Structure formats: C-alpha cells, structure tokens
Paper text:
NAL catalyses the reversible aldol condensation of N-acetylmannosamine with pyruvate to yield the sialic acid, N-acetylneuraminic acid (Neu5Ac). NAL is a class I aldolase, functioning through the formation of an enzyme–pyruvate Schiff base formed with Lys165 which carries out a nucleophilic attack on the aldehyde carbon of the open-chain form of the N-acetylmannosamine. Here, using the NAL from Staphylococcus aureus, we demonstrate quantitative conversion of a cysteine residue, site-specifically into the nonproteogenic amino acid γ-thialysine, chosen as a mimic of the natural catalytic lysine residue at position 165, using the double alkylation-elimination method and that high yields of an active, modified NAL can be purified. We then characterise the resulting enzyme activity, analyse the pH-dependency of catalysis and use X-ray crystallography to investigate the structural basis of the changes brought about by modifying the enzyme.
The purified protein was shown to have NAL activity and the kinetic parameters determined were similar to those of the E. coli NAL. In the wild-type enzyme the average Cβ–Cγ and Cγ–Cδ bond lengths in Lys165 in the four polypeptide chains in the tetramer are both 1.5 Å and the Cβ–Cγ–Cδ bond angle is 110.1°, in excellent agreement with the values of 1.53 Å, 1.54 Å and 110.0° found in free lysine. The pH profile for the wild-type S. aureus enzyme shows a typical bell-shaped profile with a pH optimum of 7.4 and two pKa values of 5.8 and 8.7.
Residue numbers in the entry:
A (entry chain A): 1 to 137, 147 to 293
B (entry chain C): -4 to 138, 147 to 293
C (entry chain B): -1 to 138, 147 to 293
D (entry chain D): 3 to 138, 147 to 293
Write the structure that this text describes.
Amino acid sequence: HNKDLKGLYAALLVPFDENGQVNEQGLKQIAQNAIETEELDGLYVNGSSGENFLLNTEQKKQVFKVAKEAVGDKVKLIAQVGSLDLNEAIELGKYATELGYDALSAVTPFYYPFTFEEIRDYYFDIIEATQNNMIIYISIEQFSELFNHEKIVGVKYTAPNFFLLERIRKAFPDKLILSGFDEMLVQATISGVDGAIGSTYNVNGRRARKIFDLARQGQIQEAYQLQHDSNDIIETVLSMGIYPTLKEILRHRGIDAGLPKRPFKPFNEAHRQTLDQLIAKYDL
Amino acid sequence: HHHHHHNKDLKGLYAALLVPFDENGQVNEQGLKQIAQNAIETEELDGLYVNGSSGENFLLNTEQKKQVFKVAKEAVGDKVKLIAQVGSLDLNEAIELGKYATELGYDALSAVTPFYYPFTFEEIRDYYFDIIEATQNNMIIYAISIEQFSELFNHEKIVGVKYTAPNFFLLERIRKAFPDKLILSGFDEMLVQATISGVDGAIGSTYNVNGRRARKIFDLARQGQIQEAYQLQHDSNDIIETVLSMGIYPTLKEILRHRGIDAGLPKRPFKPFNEAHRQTLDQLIAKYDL
Amino acid sequence: HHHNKDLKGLYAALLVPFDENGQVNEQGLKQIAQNAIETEELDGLYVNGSSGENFLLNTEQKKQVFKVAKEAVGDKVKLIAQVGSLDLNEAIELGKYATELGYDALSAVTPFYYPFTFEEIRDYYFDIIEATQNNMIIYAISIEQFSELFNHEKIVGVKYTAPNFFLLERIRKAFPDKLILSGFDEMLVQATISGVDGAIGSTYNVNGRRARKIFDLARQGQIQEAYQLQHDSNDIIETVLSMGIYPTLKEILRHRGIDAGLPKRPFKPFNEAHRQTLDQLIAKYDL
Amino acid sequence: KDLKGLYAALLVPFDENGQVNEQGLKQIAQNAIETEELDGLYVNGSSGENFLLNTEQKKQVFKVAKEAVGDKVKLIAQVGSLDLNEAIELGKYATELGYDALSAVTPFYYPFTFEEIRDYYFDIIEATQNNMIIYAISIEQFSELFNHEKIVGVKYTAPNFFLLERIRKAFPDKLILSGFDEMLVQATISGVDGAIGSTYNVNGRRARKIFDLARQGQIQEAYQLQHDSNDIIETVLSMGIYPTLKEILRHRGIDAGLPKRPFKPFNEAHRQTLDQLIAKYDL
Ligand SMILES: [Cl-]
Ligand SMILES: [Cl-]
Ligand SMILES: [Cl-]
Ligand SMILES: [Cl-]
C-alpha cells in the first residue's frame, strides 16, 4: 500500500568534489543526517536545493540511487524529475519509480514562455509514461485542470502568496499541499498545509517539527518564537550563500559535505566567524 | 494646558472608512455618518481609519478631506480610536491636514509613502519627520528595509506601521526587531496569518461589512483555536474575492445600501457598481448574511 | 498633413523654482520659461507636467504656473497644459482655466495610484474633453485600446513615455495621422527614426540645442552625427539623474544667472557633495 | 573571421519523439545562407530549442550545421548551460569543429552572484581558448567581463536603448549583436555591429536592407521595412514563434518537422492567417 505523504522533508543537499562529481559517501551521510539526526519524515531528492539543474542525467540517477540506499523502508521519498528535456524527465521518472520513490515531482517548465496547455501536457506526459503519483509546483482555474487528474496528488507550494495558498487549500481539500518556504513554516501550518520541504531542515529539522506540531496543536506563541529563532538561522545562511553554508554546518558535525558545484562558489571564509557564532547560539 | 487627554492605546480592529459621494463627486455627509456608525455599532470595531485609500482620499480636494475628518469624528463616541491618514504629495497640505486632524482630537496620524516620483529614502524619512515636527502628533508609517525601519522607528513619535506588504518573512523580522512598536496589518484576506505573526491589530475596508468575522479570526487565532480562525478566513476570503472581482469600493458600499445606508456613489474617475454584477452580489449577501 | 499634427516640435517640460516654503518663485519661473524659448530655441512649453513638480502643488499654485508661463512667451510659442489629477473636478477646473488662458492643448497623466480599469481611464479623458472642449494629448494600454481612445476626434495624440520601440512602431504605423511626442530624452534619436512628431523633455531646459540637432540630423539621414550628440546628451542625462534631476537641472540654470530657487519638499535640494562633478559637467559640455 | 554581420538563430526540426531531423536541419541551415543571404549561423541558441536537448543532440546540431555550409560562413556556437562541465565539453567540441566563436547564456534559474556569472564565463574561456560572446548587468560589471581579451562581444537582447547606447560608447572596440528582430532599425542606428534573430530564417533579406539602408542614412526606407517586418514578427509571435517559423520553411519544401515537446505543434486554426501572411510578404 502507498505511504501517507504528509510530513516534513529535507530538500536533500549534494556534496561535490573539485570537478563537480557527486561524492557518494558524503551524500549517504547527508541523507542519514536528515532522517536519524533531524528526525524528518522524508527526503525530497534532486530538487533545486540539491543543485539538480547543474547535473547531467547520469549524476541525477546516481543521487536518486544513493539516497534510496541510505534510508529505511518507512522513509518517504519524493523524486524531483522535472527538466526542460521531457525525454530526460520521463527517463528520470521511470528510473525513480523503478527504485520505489513514493511520488514524482516536476518543476514548471521554465526559461521559455510555455503556454498553460504546454505546461499541463508536460505533467500529463510524464504521468502517462511513468504511472507514478505526481506533485506539481497558475490561476485557480488552471490548478483545477491539473488537480482534475487523479495522479496529480499535490503541489510543492513555494510562491509567497497566502491568499493564493488559502484559495487552493479551500478549493482542493483532497490534495496534498507541501510548502517550500522554511521562513514561513508557521504561517503555512496555520494555513493548512499537509507538511513542508526545506533545505534548512537539514540542519534545523527539530525546531521545524516543533513549529509544525505546536502550531497545529494551537500553541501559537511558542511556535512563533521558534519561527523567530529559525529565521535568524535562515537569514544568516541566506546572506552567506545558502547551499555552501548549509553544507558547512553539516561539515561541522563530521559530515563529508564537500563543495558546491560550479558555477556556485564555495563558502567564503570571511563568513566563518559569523557562522561559528550561529552554530554556537543555536547548537547546530 | 490643564485638560486630561485620554492617551488611547491603538491596538485593535479598524474600518478603513468608506465615503459616499453624490453625482458631482461631493461628500454625502449623512451617508458618511451612517457608514462610520455601521463600522462601530453593527461591525463592533475598535476604531476608524480615516481618509485612507479606501475612503477615496486621493480623489479629494483639501476641503473635502477636512470635511471627512470632521464628520467621522462627529459620528462616533469617545471610546472609538481614530487614526487620520494625512499623507499627500503636497507636504504643505499634509501638514495642514495633520494639524486639523490633531485639533479635532484624532489619536494618531498616518501617511502613505510619498509616491509617483522616485523619492529617495532620505526624502521619505524627512517627509515623515516634517509632518511630525509641525503637528507634534504620533505617526504611523507605511510599508523599505530593516535598517531603514530602524532609523525611522528611532523617532519616538513614529509609534508604528500600517503593514500592507504581502511578505511574511519581512513582517516576522519587523515584529522581532521592534517588539514595542505598533503593527497593524492591512491585508484582510491574510488577517489570520498576520495575527499569528503578532500584529497588534488591522485596518481594512472589508471590515465595514465583515468586521464581526474579522474579530472572531483575530481572537480565535490568539486563543489558539486556529482551525476555527482559519475556517472563518475561508469564508471571509470568499467575500473579499467576490467584492474584488466587482470593484471593491463600490461593491462594499452596495452591501451597505442593502442595510438601508445612504451609500451614494464612488467619485469619478471611479465608475459606479455595474448592474451586471447585481445577481452575484445578492447571492453573496445571502450566503454570508451581510 | 493633418491638423492633428499642429503641435509637432520640441518642448521644454517647464521646471518651477520654489522658495523655502514651497511657494512658486514667479520671477525665476519667467526666467526659466524665457530660457527654454530664447536660449534653448525650443518650439514650446509643456507646462505643469511631472517635471514642474506639478503633483506637489495645490490648485492655486498650478494656476499660478499656468498664468506666468503663458505671460512669459509670445504668440508664436506652442503651449501644452498638463491638467491631469486624481481629482477629476480639479482636472476639469484646471482644464477650463488653461483653455480660457489660450493654451493650444490639454494633456493628462494616466490616472495613477489606484488600479483603475481601462474604461475608467477612458472616461476620465472623455470627461475632461467634454467639460473643456479643448484638444487632448493622452499618456501611454494596448493598440486595441489606443484605437478606442484615438477614435475621439479631440484626442489628437500621445505623450509617449514607455521604453518600448515595438509598441511605438506599432502605434506609429496604426495612427499615421495622430501626434506622437516622445518623453524619453535619452532615447530621442531612436524615437526620431521611429517617426515621432517631436519630444517633451525636462533636460531640454539646459540641452535643447543638441536635442534639436539630434532630431533634425536624424530626420535628415545624418545618423552618425545625430547619434554622436545623443552620446553627449546621455552623459548629461545620466550625470544629472545621479544627482537628482530636478534640483540639478535647476542648478545648471542658476549657473546662467537665473533665479532657480529650490525643489518643493519633500524633494531635497541639490546636495553640495555633487558640486565638483556638476561643475565638471557644465565645463565639458558648455551648459 | 571578422564576426560582424547578420545571423539566423538556427531552427531545429524534430520528429514526434523529439529527435533531431538531420536532413531538415541541413536544409534549414542552407536556407539561412543561400535563400536568406545571411553572413552566418547562430547555433544551439534558445531559438534552436537548445535547452530542451541532451548533450548528444547538441553535438549533433553543431556537426550537421557546420557540415551544411561553406567555409566562408560565420559560425557562433551557443554552449551555455547550467551544467558547467557540459558547457565546457560543448565548447571544446564546437571549437574543434571550427566554430569562429562561442557564446553562453547568463547562468539562470538560481540567483547566481555576479562573481559566479563572471567566473563561469572565465572558466569556459580558460578550458576552450576560443573567443566568447556574453549575454546581457551594470556598466561596471560589463567592464569587468570585457576587460578579458577573449570576450569579444555581447549578444544584446534587452531592448533598453539607454543601456545599449552606454555600452556602445563605453566599449567601442567590442562586438555588439542585437537579439530583438522587431527593433533592428533602432539597434542599427545605435551602432550594433550586426544581429542574431530567429525571424531572419524567413525574413533575412528585409533585415539586410534594414541594416544597410539605416547605416546609409536611408532611414525612412529602413523604417518602412521594419513596419513590414514587424507585421510578420507580430503574426508569428501570436501563433507560436518556433512552430510558425518552421511552418513557413515547410511551405518552401523544407522538412521542417515538429517542435520538441513540451512545445506543441502549429495550431491549424492559424493556417489561413498564416497563408495570408506568406502571400502578402512573399515568404
Ligand atoms: Cl528543493
Ligand atoms: Cl485604507
Ligand atoms: Cl513632464
Ligand atoms: Cl537564439
């Protein structure tokens, strides 16, 4: 039977060597850190946070495989397979489905000015070919046309608009809404999201769980205080270059967090003192 | 000199006061009093926010704005909080309106960010400082970065902010950086998210017709009945969505006509409520008992 | 030829000098208006647009500026009165006034601040026209919408200010007999070859001579020389933008012995920290 | 070669599985040069549906286009990609085929810093040793990029004529090729050394006259051809530019195939309007 997809997920980070090749041992450690240290429900694999759009197809497969290998059978797995290359997307979708990922997701085709019908049929084509459940990333009338499909089970919701989130939550009580803005987890929780996916949950998963639980449980003031504490972290990490900095924090716990893939630059050492201070203040 | 002025706290829910006009764009004073009183008595709101965007303030001449301030003041009792929006691209006008509202006893002034031209931050800062300087009243600014907010809030008479930016990350940063300043959110459709974000209150045009629900959202959310708070936000957003699609100011005033209020017309160039919307409006009023 | 083209030419968007209390300095205003015509050699004045700090003024001040500008120039000089306002009663009042004064046309900024519908924008123009019976220049809305506005016999043209040369070309093709005056001084040469009938600019108060050469040279196919003057004009425009356009333009005018006064607050005065850079600009281009 | 002149942003025909049609592609390449009379081909740009391709299809496009045209034809290889290893692999491959210059889109999607954008360009240059054409960014930053002797110019696509004028006089010895077909005459009088465009695949003769006549001071006749060209560009845009431009080529007996999904094919509800355009302008 299919797992329940509600929960909190680490948007999985990927460690690279000097030549932009995946470091499999570090990747394994990052996946395990998300589940075993940060106590999260699931991995969201090959999203933006994993520098996925910097990868070739064979690299994306290697990440899908290492992540699955790293976690137990009860860990929820969502495979972001979106690409401007629909043939690649279908091939990654099939491969991830065959590995047993619980659901696929796919970024809105981007760069070019695709029409809505082009966007809709890119999702439907991926579904036809893979037969896996799908999570999308649009007017309400358009969401409806997408959500009308039984295999589009939900949306990874990342646009910062709470009026549109509310309208969608209302219109589609039967669909999974997983929010993607860590810095607004508490507002997303009270807006009825079914969970969230975040890159900072790799280092701040415990506080994230409390915000989500406390807010649902009606303890708003304490959830909001933890949102304050979390946003210090998020703001700091953002100002230092978010991917390298998150991986520098993980490096600090003994994980082989490697480098970002160029053209991303590595963590700038002039930020080291400010980062050490953050780690100490929030015991990261 | 010797009079004991009631120094009101400015927390709570405020109607952004709507204004009824005749065919020549003149203020219908008697409809205004009705609208002001609906807000306080029927809608059970804490205060009136006067001569904001909602009151078609930027369509008015200086005399009409003074007129609006006087009539809203007349129409309510001494327990009602009053904030006077006095912002204008004409700073002399803003100072004039600021003095006149303060003399009437308005509890605070507010002023929109100077607009149209690309003013620098130094110019926006000094607009606010010049109005405060000439009126000596407390001032609520509009939303500018956190560092600039810090310079602004370092003025003792800038007591708070009418926050309309749809950004809950910046709202949270502001709430944390300035725990002792007043924050009133201006997005009716996100009142529940503002509340759990620690706003002190809210100003809205739809509170003229949905203030009872608005209060329930505000209270239930703070009491941690968040599920019930949100369900009332769903309902409210049904309303707000509908009225936005028909033209917010005329439609809101058409909802007040139905209560027997003399809601008149919007000022041109605003067009009247289009009768082609009449049947959907009637249906919305019916389902939500407005 | 069409009578819609009567108002072709090059216009100073008239600057206004104020005292410390935001009051109009009438004599310096006269000097600015005369400088535009006599020194800069322009065809006309565009009076009470944004450049004149119009939206900072009360109704009486806008009338004052309309009156003095008109008094300062001869009957040969072309006059356009920007009367647009969020207050349509004010707009109509200013319109009648400017018309009775003998202004050749009215113009009006697109209703702003609120999200007005197109139908609301259109009837704002239509109400001004009906109440004033003057010719009207609109501001830049799709071509289908332009087609609707330009069907009014009293809407003679557009003061075109969108940075978009595809839309302009489309407009110029679709309305060969309407007036098009461009409002971007830094793209005058591009507007010219795109068939504009003229231009309205704040920088022509200090650089109207180069501007006329750009316009004439480019219409004459002397594109290289015309472009070289745009390079010149763009050093000037870019420099002045970096220092605060209205106070800086007025400072250049003070350098010529004109009583240029101050910007109206909340605009701040020329910041002395730009003094050396400005002087360097004035000497380089002989301004 | 001197890089001045007019280039077709090369279109690519696909079959229903999104595989390159090599014969139609050779035909498209040759139409640009022989029929449209252009100086060169801009290869694997956005117009070629490049960003929908895998690495092997991109190589395939570079090879076919180069083998399709004479030695005297100017060739620029767009190799930009979010995958820098891929960009560098493509840059080496296109360089070894003999492309006269590389170009690379600005790294996109993620909020890259300027330092990241800069060194992406410099890393590609370092590894390929070919000349590079950047995409467009402040003047102080252009200066940092153009300080590099191998960064020989910019494909300028943002229709801001203030910034373009600023760049032209700041960098009078660098190459500037504009990317907006609908504003070619404004670009020409602003001193561009040439242009790259998708619509030049069907309308390259008018475009040459616009370029030439405008520089000859025959400004009104240049502008008239721009009116005519903008009727075409407008129409083509309203129907879906790439499938429509390819449909125009198909009218000429070329095997113009299909767009790669998720682009959809030409919608036949547009056929009559397209027929009338082709008749009106002899396309
Ligand atoms: Cl992600
Ligand atoms: Cl308001
Ligand atoms: Cl102006
Ligand atoms: Cl291209």
